[PDB]
Amino acid sequence: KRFGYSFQNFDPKRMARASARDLRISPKLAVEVCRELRGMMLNDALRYLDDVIALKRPVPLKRYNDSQGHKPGKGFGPGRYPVKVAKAIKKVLLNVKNNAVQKGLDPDKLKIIHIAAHKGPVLRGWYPRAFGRATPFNEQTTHIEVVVEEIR
Amino acid sequence: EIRIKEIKENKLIGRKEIYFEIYHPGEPTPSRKDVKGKLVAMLDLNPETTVIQYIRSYFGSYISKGYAKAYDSKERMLYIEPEYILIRDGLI
Amino acid sequence: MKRTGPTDPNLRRLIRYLRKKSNEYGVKIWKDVAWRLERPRRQRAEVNVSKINRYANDGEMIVVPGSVLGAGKLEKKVIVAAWKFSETARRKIIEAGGEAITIEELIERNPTGSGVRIME
Amino acid sequence: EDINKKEKRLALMSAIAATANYDLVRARGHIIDNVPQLPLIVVDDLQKVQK
Amino acid sequence: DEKEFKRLLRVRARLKRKKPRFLRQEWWRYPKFKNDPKWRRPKGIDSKMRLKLKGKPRSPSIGWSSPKLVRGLHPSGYEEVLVHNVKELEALDPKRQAARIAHTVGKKKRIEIIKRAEELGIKVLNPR
RNA sequence: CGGCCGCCGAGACCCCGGCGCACGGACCGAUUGGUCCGUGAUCGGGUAGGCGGGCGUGCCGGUGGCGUAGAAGCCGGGCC
RNA sequence: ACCGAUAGCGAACUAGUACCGUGAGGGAAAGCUGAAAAGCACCCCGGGAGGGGGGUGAAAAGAGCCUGAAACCGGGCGGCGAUAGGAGGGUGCGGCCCGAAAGGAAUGAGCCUCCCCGAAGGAAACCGCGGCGACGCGGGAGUACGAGGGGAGGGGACCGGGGUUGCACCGUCCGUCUUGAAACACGGGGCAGGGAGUUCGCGGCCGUGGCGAGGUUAAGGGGGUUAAGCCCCGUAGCCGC
RNA sequence: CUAAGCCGCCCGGUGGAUGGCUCGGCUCGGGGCGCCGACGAAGGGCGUGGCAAGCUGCGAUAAGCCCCG
């Protein structure tokens, strides 16, 4: 209600949606994790996030990867383990699963057909520096939106 | 090419006022005597009891707006219409 | 700057009528008077009854493309036509025995303009 | 803005004259379909009506 | 003449198809210009468009003007007249003028305008 | 090096169509003008600068109007 | 005939307030829900913040509240996309894609066939001749063709326009001083708002209008008016003769 | 059904331009009104509300007390 979804073809009979606003996590890492999770099944995405939190599986970086070391295995390449972002997105996914279940859809047939992360409001702060200079020290927040659909 | 948009009768004065448009693409503004003759011939007017109040050309348009009057009688003409218009139209 | 010409619609109509009458009768006096009236306002011709008396003969038709002023003394009987007449000039012309008429009246009386003298 | 007294008088006279022109009155926009004549002269009894 | 009218209409159509869009120099480079596409005369000392170098956008000139006979006419050949009510609609010439209803006119008045135009035989460019 | 032959090559030159400008002419406008015709091999680049016309914005005096059957504003398109 | 929240007083608001300097003193930013709070009862999830349903309202306009532009960021769609070089564009067209309305169009589109006229320009087959040769000359012939201007028949839904990209050729950004700017000369991260020939006095000149050997009032006075608008007077003075 | 990347449209976020509104400013011919204080002024400090911090108003009678209209 307060915030809208970028998905245009929402169908309440077959789809469910959830969101989280003003998350104190990195929007860039949220974007990377959402790009990895797009197009996946809900249970598979939950297992992916669990592995990332447990540090058993790196998330590749395709856009924001400066000064990032490579990882063992094929396709790496820069990668890391955004545990905080993974936890927040896991909470959002659990919420969307609850919404789908309350609607009446089978949780085992849900595919993530839409997932996105946006930059939200910036919480401003300052940090003192040398030669009497006050310099910005800001927190960037993230909005997460997810829409899942029941496949037949 | 004359198309009369409006003809109105004034009994309180005793005249017919005609508002018309002349459509002359590629031709100069028609002369007053030509417009009078064409109007009189077409509308069956009395040539000695009618004047052309004005003919106006507006920028790059080939349609000129004309206003003319036709009084009931020469008495009404001399009573209402003034001296300079009478000299210009040559009815005096 | 550009010359905007006379602002008076009556004067503009008179100039157009003068040109039309000159074309109709095949004479140059009316066109000459038209351009003389069309000359800039700050240079418009001003003529005095003294000059009219000096250079006019009895019973002559005079046309002034401007204003006629009444400084001096008039003795001849002259028919003077001008755009503007001062009150003193008109009184003096009438007393001398001429007529103070307009250019339209002069054209109506003498359409060919034969024998008319232009004075500035 | 200054205006000469004689020029103002001439303008007033011209406006008074133009008041009695049928073509100008109609072209301005006034409705004179039922007006008997122009200029419209009425008796002096009109000056005493206060209702 | 109808033949000359049609020929000049074709000439204007070809000329305005060939005419380019005159735009300010470096209009594509900045959003402040790309969002407001206009033409401004280049006046710099070293401006290539001002110097009229080949390989650069052209500049408007008096030669691009349409033929005088059909200048400003609707592509259909009629002359557009902006109409706001039935009184303005009824003053048109049905043979050679077309009516364009003002964008501000509401549906209630537009219905009456369209009906009057249909029963008078006047073409309407934007019938609702 | 001494000559020749044929081709290719500009916005130059020639031709058709259109625009404007300068000058002259006819006709027509209730404040600078408007339509049309005639001549231009002897009009059409342009910095400083001079001159003429036109487009756009706020408000006032008039005049003619639109709008909850949807004004201003904003976004993407069609036409001139 | 002043401004309309970067404007107007610095302050439309808890403004000479917050705040800076030991001190004289200096001094901001900040307006708007809706007609009515009717300001979301109840259910699922979450530690919470909140999320999803469901309600109120003509419209969420949801208090982070009228409209919500540009820059910027994320996703979806169309086009290109890992052997290709130029300031990111210009001319023409091709590939892919969009194409209801406002442009044309079933009173006929792209397209196919045929006929007539035609400016400047303008071939060749073939025949005869000149030249060592490239080749040229006379006929063909001012013919075929030619910008454009007209007509007839067939078919029956596109054409104009737009986004991206490809190919051929061309193209070393914008403003500025300078003889000379792509410059290894200066000002140039992006966007939105603001931003620079104004007023008075004197004088020269021009466009127009009034009166005219005269022209004109100043301060001020009377009438009338909601009013400072409007009407009449006012010769002191100034210029000219 | 090419990874990053580039341009265009749509949706969403961030931001607060534009538009509309105005109990506030600015400028004015005219009209009105122009000094307070040792009978203690102006300017300040501190208090004062049931829940009361700021502004405003009041002064231990403290967002107030009494009397005619």
Side-chain angles (χ1 to χ4, degrees), chain C residues 82-98:
Chain C
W83 176 246
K84 178 189 172 291
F85 278 101
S86 177
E87 288 317 299
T88 314
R90 190 187 294 279
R91 183 188 54 79
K92 285 186 176 184
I93 288 167
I94 295 319
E95 272 159 14

PDB file of all heavy atoms in Angstrom, chain C residues 82-98:
ATOM      1  N   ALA C  82      -6.372  72.686 -48.781  1.00  0.00           N
ATOM      2  CA  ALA C  82      -5.276  72.184 -47.969  1.00  0.00           C
ATOM      3  C   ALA C  82      -5.817  71.189 -46.958  1.00  0.00           C
ATOM      4  O   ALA C  82      -7.015  71.161 -46.663  1.00  0.00           O
ATOM      5  CB  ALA C  82      -4.536  73.320 -47.258  1.00  0.00           C
ATOM      6  N   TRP C  83      -4.914  70.361 -46.429  1.00  0.00           N
ATOM      7  CA  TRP C  83      -5.315  69.376 -45.431  1.00  0.00           C
ATOM      8  C   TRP C  83      -5.816  70.046 -44.159  1.00  0.00           C
ATOM      9  O   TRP C  83      -6.822  69.621 -43.579  1.00  0.00           O
ATOM     10  CB  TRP C  83      -4.153  68.439 -45.115  1.00  0.00           C
ATOM     11  CG  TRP C  83      -4.475  67.473 -44.024  1.00  0.00           C
ATOM     12  CD1 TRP C  83      -3.904  67.410 -42.789  1.00  0.00           C
ATOM     13  CD2 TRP C  83      -5.457  66.433 -44.065  1.00  0.00           C
ATOM     14  NE1 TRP C  83      -4.466  66.394 -42.059  1.00  0.00           N
ATOM     15  CE2 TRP C  83      -5.423  65.778 -42.822  1.00  0.00           C
ATOM     16  CE3 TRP C  83      -6.359  65.989 -45.037  1.00  0.00           C
ATOM     17  CZ2 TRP C  83      -6.255  64.704 -42.522  1.00  0.00           C
ATOM     18  CZ3 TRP C  83      -7.184  64.925 -44.737  1.00  0.00           C
ATOM     19  CH2 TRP C  83      -7.127  64.294 -43.490  1.00  0.00           C
ATOM     20  N   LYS C  84      -5.129  71.091 -43.705  1.00  0.00           N
ATOM     21  CA  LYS C  84      -5.494  71.780 -42.478  1.00  0.00           C
ATOM     22  C   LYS C  84      -5.446  73.283 -42.702  1.00  0.00           C
ATOM     23  O   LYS C  84      -4.549  73.791 -43.377  1.00  0.00           O
ATOM     24  CB  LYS C  84      -4.562  71.394 -41.324  1.00  0.00           C
ATOM     25  CG  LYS C  84      -4.853  72.122 -40.027  1.00  0.00           C
ATOM     26  CD  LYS C  84      -3.769  71.875 -38.999  1.00  0.00           C
ATOM     27  CE  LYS C  84      -3.968  72.752 -37.777  1.00  0.00           C
ATOM     28  NZ  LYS C  84      -3.717  74.183 -38.085  1.00  0.00           N
ATOM     29  N   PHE C  85      -6.419  73.986 -42.130  1.00  0.00           N
ATOM     30  CA  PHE C  85      -6.476  75.441 -42.160  1.00  0.00           C
ATOM     31  C   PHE C  85      -6.486  75.964 -40.733  1.00  0.00           C
ATOM     32  O   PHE C  85      -7.267  75.492 -39.901  1.00  0.00           O
ATOM     33  CB  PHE C  85      -7.723  75.938 -42.894  1.00  0.00           C
ATOM     34  CG  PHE C  85      -7.585  75.964 -44.384  1.00  0.00           C
ATOM     35  CD1 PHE C  85      -8.131  74.958 -45.158  1.00  0.00           C
ATOM     36  CD2 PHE C  85      -6.925  77.003 -45.013  1.00  0.00           C
ATOM     37  CE1 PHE C  85      -8.012  74.983 -46.530  1.00  0.00           C
ATOM     38  CE2 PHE C  85      -6.803  77.030 -46.387  1.00  0.00           C
ATOM     39  CZ  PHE C  85      -7.347  76.019 -47.145  1.00  0.00           C
ATOM     40  N   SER C  86      -5.621  76.931 -40.451  1.00  0.00           N
ATOM     41  CA  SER C  86      -5.725  77.662 -39.199  1.00  0.00           C
ATOM     42  C   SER C  86      -6.981  78.524 -39.216  1.00  0.00           C
ATOM     43  O   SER C  86      -7.487  78.896 -40.277  1.00  0.00           O
ATOM     44  CB  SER C  86      -4.488  78.529 -38.979  1.00  0.00           C
ATOM     45  OG  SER C  86      -4.610  79.296 -37.797  1.00  0.00           O
ATOM     46  N   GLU C  87      -7.501  78.824 -38.025  1.00  0.00           N
ATOM     47  CA  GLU C  87      -8.697  79.656 -37.945  1.00  0.00           C
ATOM     48  C   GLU C  87      -8.444  81.038 -38.531  1.00  0.00           C
ATOM     49  O   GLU C  87      -9.270  81.564 -39.287  1.00  0.00           O
ATOM     50  CB  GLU C  87      -9.169  79.762 -36.497  1.00  0.00           C
ATOM     51  CG  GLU C  87      -9.798  78.490 -35.956  1.00  0.00           C
ATOM     52  CD  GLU C  87     -10.739  77.835 -36.950  1.00  0.00           C
ATOM     53  OE1 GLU C  87     -11.734  78.479 -37.345  1.00  0.00           O
ATOM     54  OE2 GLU C  87     -10.482  76.675 -37.338  1.00  0.00           O
ATOM     55  N   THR C  88      -7.295  81.634 -38.205  1.00  0.00           N
ATOM     56  CA  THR C  88      -6.955  82.943 -38.750  1.00  0.00           C
ATOM     57  C   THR C  88      -6.779  82.883 -40.261  1.00  0.00           C
ATOM     58  O   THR C  88      -7.221  83.787 -40.978  1.00  0.00           O
ATOM     59  CB  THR C  88      -5.688  83.476 -38.083  1.00  0.00           C
ATOM     60  OG1 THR C  88      -5.779  83.289 -36.666  1.00  0.00           O
ATOM     61  CG2 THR C  88      -5.514  84.954 -38.380  1.00  0.00           C
ATOM     62  N   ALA C  89      -6.133  81.828 -40.763  1.00  0.00           N
ATOM     63  CA  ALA C  89      -5.946  81.695 -42.205  1.00  0.00           C
ATOM     64  C   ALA C  89      -7.280  81.556 -42.927  1.00  0.00           C
ATOM     65  O   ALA C  89      -7.497  82.180 -43.974  1.00  0.00           O
ATOM     66  CB  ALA C  89      -5.048  80.499 -42.510  1.00  0.00           C
ATOM     67  N   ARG C  90      -8.186  80.739 -42.386  1.00  0.00           N
ATOM     68  CA  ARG C  90      -9.500  80.579 -42.997  1.00  0.00           C
ATOM     69  C   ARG C  90     -10.272  81.892 -42.984  1.00  0.00           C
ATOM     70  O   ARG C  90     -10.884  82.272 -43.991  1.00  0.00           O
ATOM     71  CB  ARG C  90     -10.281  79.485 -42.270  1.00  0.00           C
ATOM     72  CG  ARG C  90     -11.567  79.071 -42.960  1.00  0.00           C
ATOM     73  CD  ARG C  90     -12.362  78.102 -42.102  1.00  0.00           C
ATOM     74  NE  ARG C  90     -11.667  76.833 -41.927  1.00  0.00           N
ATOM     75  CZ  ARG C  90     -11.661  75.852 -42.820  1.00  0.00           C
ATOM     76  NH1 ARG C  90     -12.317  75.956 -43.963  1.00  0.00           N
ATOM     77  NH2 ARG C  90     -10.980  74.741 -42.558  1.00  0.00           N
ATOM     78  N   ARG C  91     -10.242  82.604 -41.855  1.00  0.00           N
ATOM     79  CA  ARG C  91     -10.925  83.890 -41.776  1.00  0.00           C
ATOM     80  C   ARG C  91     -10.358  84.878 -42.784  1.00  0.00           C
ATOM     81  O   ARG C  91     -11.112  85.590 -43.457  1.00  0.00           O
ATOM     82  CB  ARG C  91     -10.821  84.448 -40.359  1.00  0.00           C
ATOM     83  CG  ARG C  91     -11.564  85.751 -40.149  1.00  0.00           C
ATOM     84  CD  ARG C  91     -11.258  86.336 -38.783  1.00  0.00           C
ATOM     85  NE  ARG C  91      -9.825  86.482 -38.558  1.00  0.00           N
ATOM     86  CZ  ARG C  91      -9.085  87.467 -39.049  1.00  0.00           C
ATOM     87  NH1 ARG C  91      -9.612  88.418 -39.803  1.00  0.00           N
ATOM     88  NH2 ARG C  91      -7.785  87.498 -38.777  1.00  0.00           N
ATOM     89  N   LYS C  92      -9.031  84.931 -42.910  1.00  0.00           N
ATOM     90  CA  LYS C  92      -8.411  85.871 -43.835  1.00  0.00           C
ATOM     91  C   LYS C  92      -8.736  85.528 -45.283  1.00  0.00           C
ATOM     92  O   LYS C  92      -8.998  86.426 -46.090  1.00  0.00           O
ATOM     93  CB  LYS C  92      -6.901  85.908 -43.611  1.00  0.00           C
ATOM     94  CG  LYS C  92      -6.495  86.660 -42.355  1.00  0.00           C
ATOM     95  CD  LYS C  92      -4.989  86.803 -42.246  1.00  0.00           C
ATOM     96  CE  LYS C  92      -4.611  87.645 -41.041  1.00  0.00           C
ATOM     97  NZ  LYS C  92      -3.145  87.879 -40.960  1.00  0.00           N
ATOM     98  N   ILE C  93      -8.726  84.240 -45.632  1.00  0.00           N
ATOM     99  CA  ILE C  93      -9.061  83.839 -46.998  1.00  0.00           C
ATOM    100  C   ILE C  93     -10.506  84.206 -47.319  1.00  0.00           C
ATOM    101  O   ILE C  93     -10.805  84.766 -48.382  1.00  0.00           O
ATOM    102  CB  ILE C  93      -8.804  82.335 -47.195  1.00  0.00           C
ATOM    103  CG1 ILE C  93      -7.303  82.050 -47.233  1.00  0.00           C
ATOM    104  CG2 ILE C  93      -9.465  81.842 -48.466  1.00  0.00           C
ATOM    105  CD1 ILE C  93      -6.957  80.585 -47.108  1.00  0.00           C
ATOM    106  N   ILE C  94     -11.424  83.912 -46.393  1.00  0.00           N
ATOM    107  CA  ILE C  94     -12.832  84.226 -46.621  1.00  0.00           C
ATOM    108  C   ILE C  94     -13.030  85.732 -46.755  1.00  0.00           C
ATOM    109  O   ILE C  94     -13.775  86.198 -47.626  1.00  0.00           O
ATOM    110  CB  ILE C  94     -13.703  83.632 -45.499  1.00  0.00           C
ATOM    111  CG1 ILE C  94     -13.642  82.103 -45.521  1.00  0.00           C
ATOM    112  CG2 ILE C  94     -15.140  84.099 -45.633  1.00  0.00           C
ATOM    113  CD1 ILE C  94     -13.677  81.502 -46.908  1.00  0.00           C
ATOM    114  N   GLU C  95     -12.369  86.515 -45.900  1.00  0.00           N
ATOM    115  CA  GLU C  95     -12.496  87.967 -45.976  1.00  0.00           C
ATOM    116  C   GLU C  95     -11.935  88.506 -47.285  1.00  0.00           C
ATOM    117  O   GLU C  95     -12.517  89.415 -47.888  1.00  0.00           O
ATOM    118  CB  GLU C  95     -11.799  88.617 -44.782  1.00  0.00           C
ATOM    119  CG  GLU C  95     -12.688  88.765 -43.560  1.00  0.00           C
ATOM    120  CD  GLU C  95     -11.899  88.932 -42.277  1.00  0.00           C
ATOM    121  OE1 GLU C  95     -10.682  89.199 -42.355  1.00  0.00           O
ATOM    122  OE2 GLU C  95     -12.498  88.796 -41.190  1.00  0.00           O
ATOM    123  N   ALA C  96     -10.802  87.966 -47.739  1.00  0.00           N
ATOM    124  CA  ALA C  96     -10.250  88.368 -49.025  1.00  0.00           C
ATOM    125  C   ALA C  96     -11.148  87.964 -50.184  1.00  0.00           C
ATOM    126  O   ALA C  96     -11.081  88.586 -51.249  1.00  0.00           O
ATOM    127  CB  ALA C  96      -8.856  87.770 -49.213  1.00  0.00           C
ATOM    128  N   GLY C  97     -11.982  86.941 -50.004  1.00  0.00           N
ATOM    129  CA  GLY C  97     -12.978  86.587 -50.995  1.00  0.00           C
ATOM    130  C   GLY C  97     -12.807  85.229 -51.630  1.00  0.00           C
ATOM    131  O   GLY C  97     -13.607  84.871 -52.502  1.00  0.00           O
ATOM    132  N   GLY C  98     -11.802  84.461 -51.231  1.00  0.00           N
ATOM    133  CA  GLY C  98     -11.591  83.129 -51.752  1.00  0.00           C
ATOM    134  C   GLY C  98     -12.414  82.098 -51.013  1.00  0.00           C
ATOM    135  O   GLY C  98     -13.402  82.411 -50.345  1.00  0.00           O
TER     136      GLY C  98
END
